[PDB]
Design an enzyme around this catalytic site. Structure first.
Site, PDB file in Angstrom:
ATOM      1  N   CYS A 106      11.721 -22.435 -27.615  1.00  0.00           N
ATOM      2  CA  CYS A 106      12.053 -23.494 -28.572  1.00  0.00           C
ATOM      3  C   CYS A 106      12.364 -22.895 -29.944  1.00  0.00           C
ATOM      4  O   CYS A 106      11.486 -22.295 -30.577  1.00  0.00           O
ATOM      5  CB  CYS A 106      10.916 -24.516 -28.697  1.00  0.00           C
ATOM      6  N   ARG A 109      10.575 -24.677 -33.737  1.00  0.00           N
ATOM      7  CA  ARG A 109       9.122 -24.726 -33.892  1.00  0.00           C
ATOM      8  C   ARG A 109       8.636 -24.672 -35.339  1.00  0.00           C
ATOM      9  O   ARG A 109       7.430 -24.824 -35.558  1.00  0.00           O
ATOM     10  CB  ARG A 109       8.452 -23.599 -33.095  1.00  0.00           C
ATOM     11  N   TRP A 278      15.047 -33.479 -32.410  1.00  0.00           N
ATOM     12  CA  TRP A 278      16.431 -33.832 -32.664  1.00  0.00           C
ATOM     13  C   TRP A 278      17.322 -32.684 -32.191  1.00  0.00           C
ATOM     14  O   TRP A 278      16.861 -31.561 -31.979  1.00  0.00           O
ATOM     15  CB  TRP A 278      16.636 -34.175 -34.134  1.00  0.00           C
ATOM     16  N   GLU A 283      23.709 -27.408 -28.619  1.00  0.00           N
ATOM     17  CA  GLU A 283      23.283 -27.962 -27.335  1.00  0.00           C
ATOM     18  C   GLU A 283      24.326 -28.937 -26.819  1.00  0.00           C
ATOM     19  O   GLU A 283      24.667 -28.934 -25.630  1.00  0.00           O
ATOM     20  CB  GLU A 283      21.926 -28.664 -27.458  1.00  0.00           C
TER      21      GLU A 283
HETATM   22  C1  HEM Z   1      12.679 -31.147 -33.945  1.00  0.00           C
HETATM   23  C2  HEM Z   1      13.746 -30.442 -33.580  1.00  0.00           C
HETATM   24  C3  HEM Z   1      13.807 -29.558 -32.305  1.00  0.00           C
HETATM   25  C4  HEM Z   1      14.810 -28.710 -32.067  1.00  0.00           C
HETATM   26  C5  HEM Z   1      16.020 -28.474 -33.009  1.00  0.00           C
HETATM   27  C6  HEM Z   1      14.563 -28.046 -30.806  1.00  0.00           C
HETATM   28  C7  HEM Z   1      15.385 -27.104 -30.220  1.00  0.00           C
HETATM   29  C8  HEM Z   1      15.255 -26.545 -28.961  1.00  0.00           C
HETATM   30  C9  HEM Z   1      16.267 -25.811 -28.242  1.00  0.00           C
HETATM   31  C10 HEM Z   1      17.696 -25.516 -28.758  1.00  0.00           C
HETATM   32  C11 HEM Z   1      15.745 -25.425 -27.075  1.00  0.00           C
HETATM   33  C12 HEM Z   1      16.473 -24.606 -25.998  1.00  0.00           C
HETATM   34  C13 HEM Z   1      17.143 -25.544 -25.009  1.00  0.00           C
HETATM   35  C14 HEM Z   1      18.375 -24.861 -24.484  1.00  0.00           C
HETATM   36  O1  HEM Z   1      18.971 -24.085 -25.262  1.00  0.00           O
HETATM   37  O2  HEM Z   1      18.786 -25.095 -23.320  1.00  0.00           O
HETATM   38  C15 HEM Z   1      14.377 -25.906 -26.997  1.00  0.00           C
HETATM   39  C16 HEM Z   1      13.471 -25.734 -25.973  1.00  0.00           C
HETATM   40  C17 HEM Z   1      12.223 -26.345 -25.887  1.00  0.00           C
HETATM   41  N1  HEM Z   1      11.675 -27.230 -26.784  1.00  0.00           N
HETATM   42 FE1  HEM Z   1      12.382 -27.521 -28.709  1.00  0.00          FE
HETATM   43  N2  HEM Z   1      13.377 -28.535 -30.299  1.00  0.00           N
HETATM   44  C18 HEM Z   1      12.886 -29.485 -31.178  1.00  0.00           C
HETATM   45  C19 HEM Z   1      11.721 -30.201 -30.995  1.00  0.00           C
HETATM   46  C20 HEM Z   1      10.835 -30.025 -29.955  1.00  0.00           C
HETATM   47  C21 HEM Z   1       9.623 -30.805 -29.705  1.00  0.00           C
HETATM   48  C22 HEM Z   1       9.167 -31.969 -30.599  1.00  0.00           C
HETATM   49  C23 HEM Z   1       9.042 -30.328 -28.583  1.00  0.00           C
HETATM   50  C24 HEM Z   1       7.730 -30.740 -27.878  1.00  0.00           C
HETATM   51  C25 HEM Z   1       6.663 -31.236 -28.522  1.00  0.00           C
HETATM   52  C26 HEM Z   1       9.863 -29.233 -28.096  1.00  0.00           C
HETATM   53  C27 HEM Z   1       9.580 -28.478 -26.972  1.00  0.00           C
HETATM   54  C28 HEM Z   1      10.429 -27.599 -26.343  1.00  0.00           C
HETATM   55  C29 HEM Z   1      10.190 -26.901 -25.099  1.00  0.00           C
HETATM   56  C30 HEM Z   1       8.927 -26.993 -24.231  1.00  0.00           C
HETATM   57  C31 HEM Z   1      11.254 -26.157 -24.846  1.00  0.00           C
HETATM   58  C32 HEM Z   1      11.455 -25.230 -23.649  1.00  0.00           C
HETATM   59  C33 HEM Z   1      11.893 -26.060 -22.468  1.00  0.00           C
HETATM   60  C34 HEM Z   1      12.107 -25.070 -21.354  1.00  0.00           C
HETATM   61  O3  HEM Z   1      11.555 -23.929 -21.408  1.00  0.00           O
HETATM   62  O4  HEM Z   1      12.837 -25.421 -20.394  1.00  0.00           O
HETATM   63  N3  HEM Z   1      10.944 -29.081 -28.952  1.00  0.00           N
HETATM   64  N4  HEM Z   1      14.118 -26.572 -28.165  1.00  0.00           N
HETATM   65  C1  LIG Z   2      12.620 -31.512 -27.563  1.00  0.00           C
HETATM   66  C2  LIG Z   2      13.974 -30.850 -27.575  1.00  0.00           C
HETATM   67  C3  LIG Z   2      14.805 -30.929 -28.693  1.00  0.00           C
HETATM   68  C4  LIG Z   2      16.051 -30.300 -28.651  1.00  0.00           C
HETATM   69  N1  LIG Z   2      16.889 -30.382 -29.714  1.00  0.00           N
HETATM   70  N2  LIG Z   2      16.450 -29.640 -27.548  1.00  0.00           N
HETATM   71  C5  LIG Z   2      15.663 -29.561 -26.448  1.00  0.00           C
HETATM   72  C6  LIG Z   2      16.091 -28.872 -25.327  1.00  0.00           C
HETATM   73  C7  LIG Z   2      15.261 -28.780 -24.210  1.00  0.00           C
HETATM   74  C8  LIG Z   2      15.669 -28.102 -22.953  1.00  0.00           C
HETATM   75  C9  LIG Z   2      14.706 -27.720 -22.042  1.00  0.00           C
HETATM   76  C10 LIG Z   2      15.073 -27.130 -20.845  1.00  0.00           C
HETATM   77  C11 LIG Z   2      16.403 -26.946 -20.531  1.00  0.00           C
HETATM   78  O1  LIG Z   2      16.748 -26.351 -19.349  1.00  0.00           O
HETATM   79  C12 LIG Z   2      16.072 -26.659 -18.126  1.00  0.00           C
HETATM   80  C13 LIG Z   2      16.938 -26.120 -17.008  1.00  0.00           C
HETATM   81  C14 LIG Z   2      16.898 -26.671 -15.729  1.00  0.00           C
HETATM   82  C15 LIG Z   2      17.723 -26.136 -14.748  1.00  0.00           C
HETATM   83  C16 LIG Z   2      18.561 -25.071 -15.073  1.00  0.00           C
HETATM   84  N3  LIG Z   2      18.585 -24.556 -16.314  1.00  0.00           N
HETATM   85  C17 LIG Z   2      17.798 -25.057 -17.275  1.00  0.00           C
HETATM   86  C18 LIG Z   2      17.378 -27.351 -21.423  1.00  0.00           C
HETATM   87  C19 LIG Z   2      18.835 -27.149 -21.068  1.00  0.00           C
HETATM   88  N4  LIG Z   2      18.995 -25.821 -20.443  1.00  0.00           N
HETATM   89  C20 LIG Z   2      17.014 -27.950 -22.625  1.00  0.00           C
HETATM   90  C21 LIG Z   2      14.011 -29.371 -24.232  1.00  0.00           C
HETATM   91  C22 LIG Z   2      13.573 -30.067 -25.349  1.00  0.00           C
HETATM   92  C23 LIG Z   2      14.405 -30.163 -26.454  1.00  0.00           C
END
Ligand code: HEM
Ligand SMILES: Cc1cc(N)nc2cc(-c3ccc(OCc4cccnc4)c(CN)c3)ccc12
Ligand code: HEM
Ligand SMILES: Cc1cc(N)nc2cc(-c3ccc(OCc4cccnc4)c(CN)c3)ccc12
Ligand SMILES: C[C@H](O)[C@H](O)[C@H]1CNc2nc(N)[nH]c(=O)c2N1
Ligand SMILES: C[C@H](O)[C@H](O)[C@H]1CNc2nc(N)[nH]c(=O)c2N1
Ligand SMILES: [Cl-]
Ligand SMILES: [Cl-]
Ligand SMILES: [Gd]
Ligand SMILES: [Zn+2]
Lengths: 402, 404
Positions: A106, A109, A278, A283
């Site tokens: 994430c 954070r 948000w 994304e």
């Molecule tokens: C407030 C603005 C936030 C932004 C800009 C943000 C951004 C992101 C981004 C860009 C990712 C990577 C997803 C991807 O690239 O496919 C991510 C992953 C993640 N976010 Fe954040 N997030 C936010 C808030 C939160 C909140 C509030 C939570 C939970 C309380 C959270 C929990 C997670 C988790 C657990 C992952 C990893 C999911 C995974 O490993 O599949 N995020 N976040």
């Molecule tokens: C709270 C929050 C805010 C944000 N602004 N963004 C967020 C993006 C993710 C996120 C988590 C896991 C993901 O992936 C799971 C996955 C499943 C199967 C294959 N590849 C990947 C992806 C997209 N990759 C996004 C989760 C939470 C987000």
């Protein structure tokens, strides 16, 4: 014997001593690194619980105290009589925030302390579950001024089945199979779309049809609930200086709310605990719209832009993609819906790293997920080495309930 | 056997070759250190076991594993080390080892080319002037008037006792980095150090920000001596933009030949501290990292002002727009000057194809995801959605300490 971590843009050097506390084991060995893989009883419930209770009492500067030892004793007494235990409200709030703080992939954070925790552990049915979720969506959306939030439904407990949200996010668009073998709408959601139809949903035929919720109360089949149109804030996409862009008819939604992950706190498991933040603009622009296995609009945009798509060395993909991202940022700002670009986001994550180094002596971070999917080395996280490891409390993936 | 998925298409493969990986990396079950640039840090019984491993695969690669000189060649190395403590490689072994080391470099995206590599054997070189002449034949052959050809020159192996051959510059072609009364640098900030070592060994400094450094070549034991590169041997490309008329006036240039001259070639237990290799550029190496990194030439802001971009807010993506055009100007300039170059889309697409070939040939391929994915437009290229296994095979190129 703690990893030495360098930033190559600036020259700074730190050591991640927090990594030595890594409370689980991941997929790598000295023989081989698997960092790029996407998907890497009482006495052990007791040690997980004792570690979390210790963490909670550290955070309130009250470690080793009377109230601390009492709470440990209360917990092991509860696990004896019932095989489980109940978190106090203040422990749940702290636990939910740490799981966000501990999420290595994430980039958002810096915000981890500003999380609104809704306690739905008294939730009783799928119908109540729908009411709590609607409240979440409305509080988190807040007319475009988005707020971070999580709603925690009752924990896994012996005797009863689990609450589950079957949808991977609270807001997703339908994906309909076609005659071309193709897909209309979001190809990532074909499976949940078919499930909805066979549970009684009348499908549409658009590319941006919002999906109904499939909600599962313990030992119950999933139940279908329609989201009210006026609860789902959407953003029509336009470009500031490419006026034909608005005629593509593209949209995205305001609220990214992940609803299929498991929240683990001190040995206890919450298979239904959706959380929302948000969007970071890449994304939407790069992944959701340009991935060839998603909406895959990149070549269509480039052709409209009159780019030479015959040859790769014109960099027509890079040009189209930057303009799609520009359109995303402009549309959300125009609609007054919170959004962050990958430059601001990664800059603030650098500040998070410095914050975390002073506070806990390190920060679990997954470089391949923290670095944005375009313009990687233009952001400061690119030149920052990182150490990936698993801390608890945690958000964990879990299998699909079907 | 690790399961490795490609998320773009859905295919699944298994990396059986990782099982035969030896020299342990930096990761453990408790924490991943895949993003670290230099992992960790940098009785001749060991030499025989590595020597016999290397010999065995050589004869497997030519079918002839089973009787014949395969039986025979294992003995000569046994005897050679029992007598002398080290051994010498047969010439085809040295070619085969050089190719395999390239094939095994996990951070190289250009490995589709691994079979076409010209190996110049300079093991009989015993002088600094000799090294210099050997280097110049390489540069001339590799450059080839802009039709670049992969090449490595192997200088004599390190022997137990008595010193090393060594090239001090990190590359054969590097631009000067000059400090001043600002603490800032004119030229390349990455080469501030080797310019310090160049001046204090008798080099006369230069004008500005694209001065090709002299070579600091070091014969065994006695100190390094300067050698000045002939200008007509250093093919440079001046940078122009196909439609942005003012870009050329910015006065930027880059050289044609990426020739790495500080890594250690390890074959069959032997170590070659001087084995410079060269191929040709991917354009993002020049446009994005060399010219745009904040700790390099850092030109990105200057190009945005000339493009009239809104540098007031990050959300204009002015950095991203300026970076694309710089890359466009690099591709365009090298094509105009008929100098071999490859864009990151073509390169990554070829590397996918390399992955498929290597799956059939060896059942896997060591790949370092963070170095294979290009530094711009990462998820627009196929390697982004490809899971990869990183591990160490031998023969291999390794990093080594600097000679000071
Ligand atoms: C407030 C603005 C936030 C932004 C800009 C943000 C951004 C992101 C981004 C860009 C990712 C990577 C997803 C991807 O690239 O496919 C991510 C992953 C993640 N976010 Fe954040 N997030 C936010 C808030 C939160 C909140 C509030 C939570 C939970 C309380 C959270 C929990 C997670 C988790 C657990 C992952 C990893 C999911 C995974 O490993 O599949 N995020 N976040
Ligand atoms: C709270 C929050 C805010 C944000 N602004 N963004 C967020 C993006 C993710 C996120 C988590 C896991 C993901 O992936 C799971 C996955 C499943 C199967 C294959 N590849 C990947 C992806 C997209 N990759 C996004 C989760 C939470 C987000
Ligand atoms: C022919 C065209 C070639 C291309 C396009 C190419 C491209 C690249 C690129 C982009 C990198 C990453 C460097 C960075 O951005 O930091 C790299 C690294 C590397 N290349 Fe290649 N290269 C080529 C030829 C060669 C040859 C001929 C050799 C050796 C004989 C070689 C060996 C290596 C090694 C050893 C590394 C570093 C591996 C590591 O650090 O583990 N390359 N190459
Ligand atoms: C044959 C060849 C062709 C090509 N087209 N390209 C190449 C790029 C490199 C290369 C190797 C290591 C590097 O890194 C060294 C380093 C020094 C200090 C800090 N980090 C890293 C870099 C630049 N990153 C490039 C090496 C060989 C290349
Ligand atoms: C195979 C690859 O590691 C995988 O698809 C990852 C790469 N890095 C990523 N990074 C982010 N931020 N989001 C992603 O979905 C991915 N996908
Ligand atoms: C800190 C980070 O791991 C480091 O800067 C790496 C990341 N990936 C890279 N990839 C390439 N090709 N070249 C590099 O210099 C780097 N730098
Ligand atoms: Cl999303
Ligand atoms: Cl370079
Ligand atoms: Gd226009
Ligand atoms: Zn690892």
């Amino acid at each position: 014997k703690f990893p030495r971590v360098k930033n190559w843009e600036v020259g700074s050097i730190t050591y991640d001593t927090l990594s030595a506390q890594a409370q689980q084991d991941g997929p790598c060995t000295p023989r081989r690194c698997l960092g790029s893989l996407v998907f890497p009883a009482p006495e052990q419930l007791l040690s997980q619980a004792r570690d979390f209770i210790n963490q909670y009492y550290s955070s309130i500067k009250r470690s080793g105290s009377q109230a601390h030892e009492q709470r440990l004793q209360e917990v092991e007494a509860e696990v004896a009589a019932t095989g489980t235990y109940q978190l106090r409200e203040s422990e749940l709030v702290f636990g939910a925030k740490q799981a966000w703080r501990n999420a290595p992939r994430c980039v958002g954070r810096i915000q981890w302390g500003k999380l609104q925790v809704f306690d739905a552990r008294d939730c009783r049915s799928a119908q109540e579950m729908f009411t709590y979720i609607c409240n979440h969506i409305k509080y988190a959306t807040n007319r475009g001024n988005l707020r971070s939030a999580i709603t925690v439904f009752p924990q896994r407990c012996p005797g009863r089945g689990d609450f589950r949200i079957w949808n991977s996010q609270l807001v997703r668009y339908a994906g309909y199979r076609q005659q071309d073998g193709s897909v209309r709408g979001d190809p990532a959601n074909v499976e949940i779309t078919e499930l909805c139809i066979q549970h009684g949903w009348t499908p549409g035929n658009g590319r941006f049809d919002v999906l109904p919720l499939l909600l599962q109360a313990p030992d119950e089949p999933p139940e279908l609930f329609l989201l009210p149109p006026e609860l789902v804030l959407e953003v029509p996409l336009e470009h500031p200086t490419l006026e034909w862009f608005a005629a593509l008819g593209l949209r995205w939604y305001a609220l990214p709310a992940v609803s299929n992950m498991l929240l683990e706190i001190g040995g206890l498991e919450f298979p239904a605990a959706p959380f929302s933040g948000w969007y970071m603009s890449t994304e939407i622009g790069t992944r959701n719209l340009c991935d060839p296995h998603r909406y895959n609009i990149l070549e269509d945009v480039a052709v409209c832009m009159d780019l030479d798509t015959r040859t790769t060395s014109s960099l027509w993909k890079d040009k189209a993609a930057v303009e799609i991202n520009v359109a995303v940022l402009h549309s959300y700002q125009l609609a007054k819906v919170t959004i962050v670009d990958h430059h601001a986001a990664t800059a603030s994550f650098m500040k998070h790293l410095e914050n975390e180094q002073k506070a806990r002596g390190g920060c679990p971070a997954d470089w391949a997920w923290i670095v944005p999917p375009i313009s990687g080395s233009l952001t400061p996280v690119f030149h920052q080495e990182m150490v990936n490891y698993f801390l608890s409390p945690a958000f964990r993936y879990q299998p699909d309930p079907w």
